[PDB]
Structure 1
C-alpha cells in the first residue's frame, strides 16, 4: 500500500483523494495520505479554503515512482514532485507514519467504487491527454480547455481529448450524408474504434477520465467530452453487445457517485433524454436508466 507524504500544509485546503475528501486547517500538522490501493490510478485534488477558484490536482500511479506534495508559496499551490532517492523517501514516510501525521485512504472492503470508475483508465493514456513528458504524474485544473474548445488559447496547458464532432467530414462519408448523420455506427466503429482508439478499452478509458475531470475539477470541456462519447455510442445502431453492457455498468457507477447537488451542472438534459428515451440504444442501458429515473427524475 503506497504513500504520498506532504512536506506541510501552510494554507487551509480541502484535499480530495479519489472519491474521498477532508479539510486541512492552515499550518495543521498534516503530512500526507497512506494505505493508497495499488493497482489503480489515483487523483489527489485541492480546493483552497480562502479561494475556491483554486481547484486543481494530480493524476498518478504509485507503481511509477515515489511522489510527494509540497506547497509553493510563489505559485500559491500544492505541487506534486517525484522523489528520486528511495532511501530518503522511505525514511520520510516512516517518520510521518510513526508520528501518525497521515490520513489513511478510507477504503471499505466491500467497496469497488473506485475500480468501477477507473476500470479502463491507465496512466500512459492520461499522459497523452495531458502533455508534460518530464513528470510521471499529470496536472489538471478547473479552467484547462480542450483542443476542441480551443478550435471553436495556450496549446501546452490543454486537454488533448479525441475531437468528436457530429457535423464534420471525419463523421460523415461523402455519399452517405443521411446514413452517417442519423446512424453514427461508421464514425464510432471505423473512425473512432478501429482508427483512433484501436479498441473499446481505450475509448472507455478516455470517457471515464473525462467524467472524473468533470466531477473532481468542474472542468467544463471534460463534461462536454464525456457526454459526446456517450452520445456517439447511443446514436449508433450497430454496437457490439459487450460494449453496450460495459457502457451500462460504466454509466451506472458514474451516476451513483455524482453528488446530487452537482447534478444540475454535471448532466446535460438533451443528451441524457436522447440517450435513454430516443436513441438506438434507449433499451440497452437498463441499470443506468433505473438509477437515473430514481436519483434524477427532474432531469428526465
Structure 2
C-alpha cells in the first residue's frame, strides 16, 4: 500500500482519487492519501472551491517513484512532484501517518470498479499520449485539446490520442470506398490493431484512458476519442470474439460508473443508438445494452 503525501492544503479544494472524492477546507491540516492499491494506475484530481472551472489532475503509478503534492501559490495549483530521496520521503510519510493527517484510499474489498476501468491502462502508454518526459506522472485538465482537434494550438500541452477519421485515405482503400466505409474491419484490424496499436490491449488502454479523462476532467476531445474508438469496433463486421466480449465488459463498467447527471454531456446519442441498434455488433454487447436501457433509456 503506497502514499501520496501533501505538503499542505492552503486553498479550499475538492480532491479526487480515482472514483473517490473529499472536500478539504482552506488551511485544513490535510497531509495526503495512504493505502493506495499497488498494481494499478491512479489519478489524483482537483477542483478549487473558488473556481469550479478547470478540473486538473495527475496520472501516476506508485511503483515508478515517490510522489507528493505541493500547492504552488504563483501558478495557483496543486502540483505533483517526485521526491528522489527515499529516506526523506519514508520519514515524511511515517510522521503524517503517526499524526493521522491522511485520508485512506477507501476501497471496498468486494469492489473491482477501479481494476475494471483501468484493466488495459498502462502508465508507459499514458506518457506517450501526454508528453512531458522529465516527469513520471502525467498532467491532464478540462481544456487540453487533442492532436486531432489541433488539425481542425500549443503542441506541448495536447493529448496525442491516435487519430481516427472515417473519411480519410488511412480509413479507405482505393477501389474499396463503399466496402471500407460501410464495414470498417480493414481500418480496425489491419490499420489500427496490426499497424498502430499492435494488439487489442493497447487499443482498449487508450479507449479506457480517453473515457476517464472525459469523466474526471470533462475533457471534450477525450470524449470524442472514446466514442470514435467504440464506433470503429461497432462499425466493423469482423472483430475477434474475445475483443467483443471484452468491449462489452469495458463499456458496462464505464456506463455503470458515469455520474447519472452527466449522461446528457458525456454520451453521444448517435454513436450509442448506432452501436446498440444499427451496427454489425448490435447483438454483441448484451451487458452494455442492458445497463444503457435500464440507466439511460431517454438517450435511446
TM-score by length of 1: 1.00
CA offset digits 1:24-82 (Å, max 9, x no partner): 00000000000000000000000000001131000000000000000000000000000
Q: Secondary structure at the match of 1:274?
A: helix
CA offset digits 1:228-252 (Å, max 9, x no partner): 0000000000000000000000000
Distance in 2 separating the partners of 1:213 and 1:244: 23
Q: How many residues align?
A: 300
Structure-2 residue corresponding to 1:33? 33
Distance in 2 separating the partners of 1:50 and 1:35: 29
Alignment of 1:47-62 (within 5 A): 47-62=47-62
Q: Which runs of 5+ in 2 are unaligned?
A: none
CA contact (8 A) 2:4 2:69 kept: yes
Q: Which runs of 5+ in 1 are unaligned?
A: none
TM-score by length of 2: 1.00
CA contact (8 A) 2:71 2:77 kept: yes
Structure-2 residue corresponding to 1:292? 292
Distance in 2 separating the partners of 1:104 and 1:8: 17
Q: After TM superposition, give the deviation of residue 286 of structure 1 in Å.
A: 0.2
Q: Secondary structure at the match of 1:168?
A: coil
CA offset digits 1:266-287 (Å, max 9, x no partner): 0000000000000000000000
Greater shift, 46-55 or 108-117, is seen at: 46-55
Distance in 2 separating the partners of 1:97 and 1:257: 30
CA contact (8 A) 2:38 2:62 kept: yes
RMSD: 0.3
Distance in 2 separating the partners of 1:50 and 1:263: 25
Q: Is residue 283 from structure 1 mapped to residue 269 from structure 2 by the alignment?
A: no
CA offset digits 1:105-142 (Å, max 9, x no partner): 00000000000000000000000000000000000000
